[PDB]
């Protein structure tokens, strides 16, 4: 645990919460973890328990074991959840996949929807409703979701989380949206608009955020030009980059703590060695769970 936490220095400056990732392993696997995460951050994703394949592995048979385990750690501990992810094409059962009758698979996803949110119902902060549903040139990507029951089901989902869950923030969430003018972002903006103007329930969009060395200063223009598509608010919500430079995550602190509308930054993971991307050594702690540079310099920037 950093003396200083770069959670409550955020929030200082008007913000929700700066927050990490979790689940039962990286919650139990040493001391230090956990600790870091109840110290320096006010917000939690699961990082896998939520998904899917995680919850719902047979057709109407639901396993909440991991996913409890997350949401009781954060409410037990005073921190804000994330809820990732309702619709999405990755970690998806094969017998998702499957199904070619649209009013059946509307059915499923309306059912996934209602039990994973209902059982959460209250706790949750925000929900990444749809996840990476855009191709890098702006279309709609051929998921089995858009195949099947074609961009109706967009609607269908977030309609479906509203009227479940009233008290979350209904998230779009997707990478690459890194930089103003890129296909990807302008793709984002444009169908944002389009859906909003519709009356569909779209809260906030949630950007990845997973740099490479070099890639901090353009998200500042990129949660500009995001801001333009008409949510409520927009979040950087699975940030890390490669080498974890002081200079790139100063630069991604301040493109946020800059624009109104976004409310808070998720880090995708605490120490290095639980990383995804490991090889690059992308987050903020390092082998031994201790504050690297780029942690003082975002405490030292607050
Ligand atoms: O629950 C996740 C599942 O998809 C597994 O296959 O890969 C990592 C796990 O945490
Ligand atoms: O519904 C309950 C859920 O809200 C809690 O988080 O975990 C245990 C479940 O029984
Ligand atoms: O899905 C992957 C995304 O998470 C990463 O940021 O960029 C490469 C993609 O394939
Ligand atoms: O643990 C990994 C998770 O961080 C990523 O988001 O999805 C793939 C998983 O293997």
Redesign the pocket.
Known sequence: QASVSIDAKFKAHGKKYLGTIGDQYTLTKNTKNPAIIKADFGQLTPENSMKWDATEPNRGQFT?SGS?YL??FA?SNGKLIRGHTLVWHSQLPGWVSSITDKNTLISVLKNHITTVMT??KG?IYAWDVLNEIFNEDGSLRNSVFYNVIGEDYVRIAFETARSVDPNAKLYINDYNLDSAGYSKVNGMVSHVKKWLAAGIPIDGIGSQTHLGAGAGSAVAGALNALASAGTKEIAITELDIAGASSTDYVNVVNACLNQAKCVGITVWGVADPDSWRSSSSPLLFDGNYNPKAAYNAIANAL
């Open positions: 909440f409890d949401v009781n409410q059982r959460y706790k």
